[PDB]
Design a protein around this nucleic acid. Sequence first.
RNA 1: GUCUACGGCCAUACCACCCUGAACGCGCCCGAUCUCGUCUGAUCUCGGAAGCUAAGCAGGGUCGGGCCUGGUUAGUACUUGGAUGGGAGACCGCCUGGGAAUACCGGGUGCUGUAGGCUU
RNA 2: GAGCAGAAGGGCAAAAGCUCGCUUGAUCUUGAUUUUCAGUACGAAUACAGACCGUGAAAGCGGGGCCUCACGAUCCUUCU
RNA 3: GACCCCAGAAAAGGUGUUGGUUGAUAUAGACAGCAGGACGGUGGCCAUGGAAGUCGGAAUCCGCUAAGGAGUGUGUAACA
RNA 4: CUCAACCUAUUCUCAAACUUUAAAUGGGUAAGAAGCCCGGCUCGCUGGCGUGGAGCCGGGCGUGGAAUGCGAGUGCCUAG
RNA 5: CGGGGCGGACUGUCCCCAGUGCGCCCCGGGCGGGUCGCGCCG
Lengths: 159, 61, 293, 170, 205
Amino acid sequence: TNTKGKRRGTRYMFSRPFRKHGVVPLATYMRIYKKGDIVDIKGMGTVQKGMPHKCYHGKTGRVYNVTQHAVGIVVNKQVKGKILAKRINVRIEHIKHSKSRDSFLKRVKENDQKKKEAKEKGTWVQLKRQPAPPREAHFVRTNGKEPELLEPIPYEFMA
Amino acid sequence: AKSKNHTTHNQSRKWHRNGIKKPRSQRYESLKGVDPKFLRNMRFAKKHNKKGLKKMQANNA
Amino acid sequence: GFVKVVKNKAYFKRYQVKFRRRREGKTDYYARKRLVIQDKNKYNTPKYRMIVRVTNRDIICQIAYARIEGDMIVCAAYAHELPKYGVKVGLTNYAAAYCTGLLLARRLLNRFGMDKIYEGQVEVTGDEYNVESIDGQPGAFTCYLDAGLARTTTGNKVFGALKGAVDGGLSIPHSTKRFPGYDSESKEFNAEVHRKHIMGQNVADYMRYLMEEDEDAYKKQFSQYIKNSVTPDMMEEMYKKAHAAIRENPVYEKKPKKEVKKKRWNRPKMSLAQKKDRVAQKKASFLRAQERA
Amino acid sequence: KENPMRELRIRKLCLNICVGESGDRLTRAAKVLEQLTGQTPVFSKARYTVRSFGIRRNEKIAVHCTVRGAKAEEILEKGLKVREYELRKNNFSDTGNFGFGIQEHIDLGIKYDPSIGIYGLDFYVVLGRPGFSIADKKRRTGCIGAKHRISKEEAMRWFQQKYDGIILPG
Amino acid sequence: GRRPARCYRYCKNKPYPKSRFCRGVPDAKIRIFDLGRKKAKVDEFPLGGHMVSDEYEQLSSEALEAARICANKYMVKSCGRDGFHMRVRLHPFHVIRINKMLQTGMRGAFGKPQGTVARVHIGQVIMSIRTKLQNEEHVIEALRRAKFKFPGRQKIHISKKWGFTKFNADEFEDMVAKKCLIPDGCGVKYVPSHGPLDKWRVLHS
RNA sequence: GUCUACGGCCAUACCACCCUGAACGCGCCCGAUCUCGUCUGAUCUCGGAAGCUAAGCAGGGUCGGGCCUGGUUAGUACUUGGAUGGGAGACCGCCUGGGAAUACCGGGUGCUGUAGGCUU
RNA sequence: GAGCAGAAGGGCAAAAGCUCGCUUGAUCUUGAUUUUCAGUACGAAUACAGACCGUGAAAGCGGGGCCUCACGAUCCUUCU
RNA sequence: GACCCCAGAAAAGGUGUUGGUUGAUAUAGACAGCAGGACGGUGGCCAUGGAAGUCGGAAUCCGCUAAGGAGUGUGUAACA
RNA sequence: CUCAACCUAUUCUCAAACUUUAAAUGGGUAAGAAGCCCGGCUCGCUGGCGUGGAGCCGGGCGUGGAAUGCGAGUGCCUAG
RNA sequence: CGGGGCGGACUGUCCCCAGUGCGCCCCGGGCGGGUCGCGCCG
Ligand SMILES: [Mg+2]
Ligand SMILES: [Mg+2]
Ligand SMILES: [Mg+2]
Ligand SMILES: [Mg+2]
Ligand SMILES: [Mg+2]
Ligand SMILES: [Mg+2]
Ligand SMILES: [Mg+2]
Ligand SMILES: [Mg+2]
């Protein structure tokens, strides 16, 4: 009953944000994408060429091919009870670098530095992230001031 | 005469019985779909790795 | 009032400003995208371009490649440094455009060390010339003309700067359709009147044309030409000496910065306390003037 | 006292002859404009088909030309001879430009011709100061600012001062 | 030939306004929403009384007209034709449909417009009366009578606001005194202490 | 402290009006022989340098509009999960977690990259 | 707040609109991919690669229409 | 009357009883009962066939007062 | 003097096929040894440049780089 | 919650009226955190 049109239900998905129409800023064309880096697929609607399908908006993939204006992205797609790695050609206006990989790559370099310093200095330091532990025991000063009494307020019809 | 038209009921239960497995990623993914001009140059680079082997083992030693 | 205010509050709330350099009318972003953006399978390869900007009194030739944090100019040559080399008057004309384009090419090639290789066309003739890379040697520097908002018709001075640069040794793709020697009706390039324009012979023709017709108009037009004693018979040789001096030494020596006392010329921004005090004083003066009645 | 870069001047003159229809009448009208200006005029077509006026879309309806400089100043004086230097108060627009019309083109200084008719035309002087051209330049175009604009009162003052004209209170 | 209002009492559908998609809508029965001395100034009628629904339901335009007339007649009787001002604060913007039965059955059952109702929420004001202080008992009785025209359960409230404004009656007068408020017909204009000083100089003079 | 050329982010940068602008510059400005375009050397293109900061431009101002960012609105609206909770229902309360948006009241009013000038 | 052939939605301002100038990339080819999907086909589409061209000063852009629709197996026939 | 689904009920009422909210009067004598007064201008004006407080349209006062509306109802053609 | 329309500043009430703003629940990806860091070699691709990119060859690094739980991977035939 | 000396800017109190920031130094009061801190108490 639903049509099979390639852009059905993308009325807001491909529309530009409020007061962000017009010329595409040029630094989006100056980003360097190499084979192996992780890119989020957005899909702006100012450029109608190389548009990803609506099922890839909001998905993150890995670049495997670079051409003059586009990249090839290996992005997972869930089809009923199986996930299969699609390969899509997307022009660079519809992608951006994923900061999740940048954060992890930063933490790897910091970890390798921390091991290097700890070995050369003679220390052991926790490198794994730990989940937020239970709060430690502490003292709360009243500073000579009694805590303020709180009581529920009477009901009244506001307006 | 008339009957049910469509449902995804019980479908998710069927999908998860054998699990929804992520595709088997592994080292050395295939080169299908890569730029032909780039790809045929890499074949030339691989073909000519033979020369410079003497320089490689000299440097490694 | 009789008509709806078009620029009301709702108009400003939804107004989207254009890019800042579009609002100032300095950048054509339709042209800039096609001209500074490198192919993605070339990665960090710089895409060089020659920015030629002709001003009311100057010619600016720069070579830049685009980065995310802003453009990077690697070599700049101006027409106001031409008095160092021969020509002292009559800048911002076609012959000075050739000289500053040639100066930019020689300055850049000297910075890269490609001086003896890629001499270019030392003997100036107006016909088409394109430098070819030499095997076993570093390749010719390749850049593309950036005319900006200039109307690129035949005889535009940006193509004079291009002609100077390609004759200097830079490889810039071009055709001779836009050089002053080109004829639109016959669709053929003269290459001799173009050489005259490079040598400033059209300006020398004007000087002697005014000398014979009306000496008062000649004084009015070329007033700064009588000063510095530049005459039509010596224009061509002066430009040739300028070319040779550009060839010999294109290195730019930045003038040393002088000691300066720090002076505030423009008014600083008024503070919040000052603004509130100003409002309070204005209110008090209104009430005081009112009770005076 | 005043800055010399504020003195008023004439930008253009913009003569216009709106003939009803196309044909030999319009060709004669363009001939009149050419005789008046020494300058080839341009025909303008109709935006829309209006059958109460008898015009159709894209049909050559009028002929007009714009004159600048010394020739404009000469033609304006010829037109003001016919008007006897008497422009009504409302002839001046709020943007500092004014205009008038004449009914017969013969008294402009052109000899009559049996083949040519009795065409009238519109004069519309556009006033300006030096620096008005920044709104027309291609690179770094801008507006002229509030002080530098011309009001209706300033245009009327210019006409009274320069052409010793009389502004009727109409 | 109208269905009982019990058939359209509840907000079962999405809002179905009269638009370019819903055409052929008959006009709502209520066309007048303000009665009494609508031209009275803000300080003439400092007392405000509301009828407030307690049910998320739909009130037909027929019922709003009936309750408007019922409250108007009592207010006129007990306060005169210029002693009050009433404002119906519900507009029937939701179109209810009817699938008209004499094709037969439920085939193609989507209905045609039948009438309009207003969707009211818990705590929403249905009707308002502003009047002088000495008519408080008459406002309560007028709104009590108009309750009988509505399906649900409604409460009569005497607001702490001054008249039909959004400002409390115990700080309204001194705000007018210090020019934070300026009358304009039946309401007030709030003048904040920001903007051009020429507006401030228009005041205090 | 500023400007010019080219820019990045694309209003904290926009819009309206007012004031000030030293030096370089940027302009306005002067002219149509050549190059080139016009109905019109107005625009464009070219050749200039008498005059001027009037305009653009820059800086500042306005209990300015907008924009940006906070407070409030408000633990409100809405909401994940729970009950053999309430109620004739419509709906509502509680438990367990998450949590807004106006109006209204404050603060702010471009940062910056490369190259090149001026500033006793 | 116009226009972009048409339904609607998106998009677009020295644009993608309007007017001119020159043109035939609406051409010849092999694969890959996306969309529906069973991950079959058709249709449509995307990114390339190899020719030959157009246009522009050039960077480039173009293998139809700004994007989402406008269409068709076996067998047989017909043309190249 | 009597336990999720669930197997029957609404608007609206009650001087049945229970709890709550807000307000008012009162030893300067509440409330309720019984018992007295309830006056003049003035049978106020405009209305009509007659409307005297009491079919109605407006007005809404003053004096004597402890108090008495130029009137809350019953009643009369109007009075009474 | 008055009523319309117009404009300005306000005011009541709304939107499945409206929207500046904008949740909760939700969808994708990452949380290393196929990683990191050093050297070198190949290229007909790219190219001012020993420039970029990719591939290849050696070497050194284990605190195995969140929690929790679980043994996984893979093929054929196949009924209802 | 503030005091002294120099530079800009504001006000319809302009007589050398009043008021507001900024840049350098000399003082004063209050608050918080580090300090081999140092003592005393638990
Ligand atoms: Mg079935
Ligand atoms: Mg262009
Ligand atoms: Mg019935
Ligand atoms: Mg429904
Ligand atoms: Mg503001
Ligand atoms: Mg909750
Ligand atoms: Mg091709
Ligand atoms: Mg297309």
